[PDB]
Design a protein around this motif. Sequence first.
Motif, PDB file in Angstrom:
ATOM      1  N   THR A  88     -65.096   9.405 -45.922  1.00  0.00           N
ATOM      2  CA  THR A  88     -63.864  10.186 -46.097  1.00  0.00           C
ATOM      3  C   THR A  88     -62.802   9.516 -45.218  1.00  0.00           C
ATOM      4  N   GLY A  89     -61.586   9.508 -45.699  1.00  0.00           N
ATOM      5  CA  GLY A  89     -60.474   8.905 -44.979  1.00  0.00           C
ATOM      6  C   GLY A  89     -59.139   9.201 -45.642  1.00  0.00           C
ATOM      7  N   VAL A  90     -58.095   8.447 -45.264  1.00  0.00           N
ATOM      8  CA  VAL A  90     -56.729   8.579 -45.782  1.00  0.00           C
ATOM      9  C   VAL A  90     -56.175   7.190 -46.083  1.00  0.00           C
ATOM     10  N   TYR A  91     -55.590   6.995 -47.276  1.00  0.00           N
ATOM     11  CA  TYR A  91     -55.004   5.695 -47.603  1.00  0.00           C
ATOM     12  C   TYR A  91     -53.506   5.785 -47.909  1.00  0.00           C
ATOM     13  N   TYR A  92     -52.752   4.716 -47.650  1.00  0.00           N
ATOM     14  CA  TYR A  92     -51.321   4.702 -47.962  1.00  0.00           C
ATOM     15  C   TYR A  92     -51.097   4.151 -49.370  1.00  0.00           C
ATOM     16  N   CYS A  93     -50.343   4.902 -50.184  1.00  0.00           N
ATOM     17  CA  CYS A  93     -50.041   4.499 -51.560  1.00  0.00           C
ATOM     18  C   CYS A  93     -48.532   4.227 -51.696  1.00  0.00           C
ATOM     19  N   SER A  94     -48.118   2.924 -51.659  1.00  0.00           N
ATOM     20  CA  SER A  94     -46.707   2.572 -51.702  1.00  0.00           C
ATOM     21  C   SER A  94     -46.002   2.992 -52.987  1.00  0.00           C
ATOM     22  N   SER A  95     -46.694   2.955 -54.150  1.00  0.00           N
ATOM     23  CA  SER A  95     -46.105   3.384 -55.438  1.00  0.00           C
ATOM     24  C   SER A  95     -45.752   4.883 -55.475  1.00  0.00           C
ATOM     25  N   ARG A  96     -46.192   5.653 -54.468  1.00  0.00           N
ATOM     26  CA  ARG A  96     -45.837   7.071 -54.356  1.00  0.00           C
ATOM     27  C   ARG A  96     -45.175   7.402 -52.998  1.00  0.00           C
ATOM     28  N   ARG A  97     -45.047   6.406 -52.076  1.00  0.00           N
ATOM     29  CA  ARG A  97     -44.539   6.575 -50.707  1.00  0.00           C
ATOM     30  C   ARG A  97     -45.288   7.746 -50.020  1.00  0.00           C
ATOM     31  N   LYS A  98     -46.624   7.786 -50.219  1.00  0.00           N
ATOM     32  CA  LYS A  98     -47.415   8.913 -49.714  1.00  0.00           C
ATOM     33  C   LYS A  98     -48.806   8.490 -49.228  1.00  0.00           C
ATOM     34  N   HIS A  99     -49.359   9.235 -48.258  1.00  0.00           N
ATOM     35  CA  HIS A  99     -50.746   9.018 -47.834  1.00  0.00           C
ATOM     36  C   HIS A  99     -51.600  10.076 -48.577  1.00  0.00           C
ATOM     37  N   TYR A 100     -52.814   9.708 -48.984  1.00  0.00           N
ATOM     38  CA  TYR A 100     -53.695  10.625 -49.699  1.00  0.00           C
ATOM     39  C   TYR A 100     -55.077  10.673 -49.043  1.00  0.00           C
TER      40      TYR A 100
END
Length: 139
Positions: A54-66
Amino acid sequence: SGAIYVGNYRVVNRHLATHNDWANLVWEDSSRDLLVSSTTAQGCDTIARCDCQTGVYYCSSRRKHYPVSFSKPSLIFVEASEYYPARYQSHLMLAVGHSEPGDCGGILRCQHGVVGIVSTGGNGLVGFADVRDLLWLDE
Ligand SMILES: NC(=O)[C@H]1CCCN(C(=O)Cc2ccncc2Cl)C1
Ligand SMILES: [Zn+2]
């Protein structure tokens, strides 16, 4: 785009490496889509040494962490592209989530530190190139 900076090392997707990365090459692996180059400045990212799923990744195409649940590193088949023929990519972890080609390089992190970087995607699944086994990054 995106890279990991730890000590005198820079970790990037091998398909996105620059001329400078190749001219200061330390190690590269096509089967993992990873390349490591040397740097003059010092890096302060902490690599995780764990078996977190389990973790958190940065998604540049949404300017959001998930936040995501992800599989353990393994050999997974990856469709042909302009960078590689059709092949099994090793040390790959999958999660249910959004990703677009320009999202490669986005960091995946758990409570212990950096786990890996975005490397593949499609069909609502995102793939991360694991870096936790590269013990030499800390010495
Ligand atoms: N690691 C590789 O071989 C990648 C090289 C670039 C192309 N690869 C992709 O998966 C690109 C992609 C497509 C659609 N949504 C997200 C992404 Cl990251 C594969
Ligand atoms: Zn962890």
